[PDB]
C-alpha cells in the first residue's frame, strides 16, 4: 500500500552517459531543436515515450557536427531517455 | 550516419544506487512482473508500454519482508533507458 520514493520520474537527456552534447551557436542545441519541433507537431496527441523516441531518431538522423577542427568533424549524437514512470503520459484530455 | 550508441534499450530492475529485491521462492520482483506482462501483452504492446506496465507492477504489487526491521517493508521501481529510434513491437 505504498509507492517508491523514486517512482514517477523521467529524465530526457540530450545525450548518453560519458558523451558530449552538441549545440549550434546559431540554431541552438540539437536535442532542444528536435524536442520542440516534435512537441509542436505531436505534443498533444502522442505519449511521452513516443514523443521522446521520435526525438531520439530526429537528433540521430538529422544532425552532424560541422567544425574546422577535424577531430570534432562529422560527429553524431543520440539522446537518452530514463523512465521510472508507472503509466502512459499524455499532455491532453 | 547513425550514432554508434543508438537503438539500445536497457531495462534495469532498479534505479542507480539502489538495491534490487528477489524472493527466494518466487524469484526477483522485476522478472516476476516482466514475465506476467510479456505473457499477456508481449505481442500487442510497444516495448515501452510493456516496460512501463512492469514498472507499475513492481512498484505497487510488491513489498519486502524480513525479520530485520531495517529491511522490512521496502519498495522498488525499475529503470528503463531507451536509446531506441523507433517503436518496438514483437510481431507482424
Amino acid at each position: 500500500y505504498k509507492i517508491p520514493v523514486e517512482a514517477d520520474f523521467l529524465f530526457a537527456y540530450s545525450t548518453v552517459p560519458g558523451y558530449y552534447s552538441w549545440r549550434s551557436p546559431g540554431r541552438g542545441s540539437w536535442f532542444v531543436q528536435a524536442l520542440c519541433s516534435i512537441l509542436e507537431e505531436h505534443g498533444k496527441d502522442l505519449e511521452i515515450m513516443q514523443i521522446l523516441t521520435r526525438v531520439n531518431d530526429r537528433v540521430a538522423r538529422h544532425f552532424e557536427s560541422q567544425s574546422d577542427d577535424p577531430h570534432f568533424h562529422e560527429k553524431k549524437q543520440i539522446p537518452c531517455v530514463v523512465s521510472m514512470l508507472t503509466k502512459e503520459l499524455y499532455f491532453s484530455q | 550516419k547513425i550514432p554508434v550508441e543508438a537503438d539500445f534499450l536497457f531495462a534495469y530492475s532498479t534505479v542507480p544506487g539502489y538495491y534490487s529485491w528477489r524472493s527466494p521462492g518466487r524469484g526477483s520482483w522485476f522478472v516476476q512482473a516482466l514475465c506476467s506482462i510479456l505473457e499477456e501483452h508481449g505481442k500487442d504492446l510497444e516495448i515501452m508500454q510493456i516496460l512501463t506496465r512492469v514498472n507499475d507492477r513492481v512498484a505497487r504489487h510488491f513489498e519486502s519482508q524480513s525479520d530485520d526491521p531495517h529491511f522490512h517493508e521496502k519498495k522498488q521501481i525499475p529503470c528503463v533507458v531507451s536509446m531506441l529510434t523507433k517503436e518496438l513491437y514483437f510481431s507482424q
Binding site: 505519449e47 | 510497444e46 517503436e87
Partner: peptide
C-alpha cells in the same frame, strides 16, 4: 500499430 488514449 494502434496506440490510442
Amino acid at each position: 500499430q494502434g496506440h490510442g488514449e
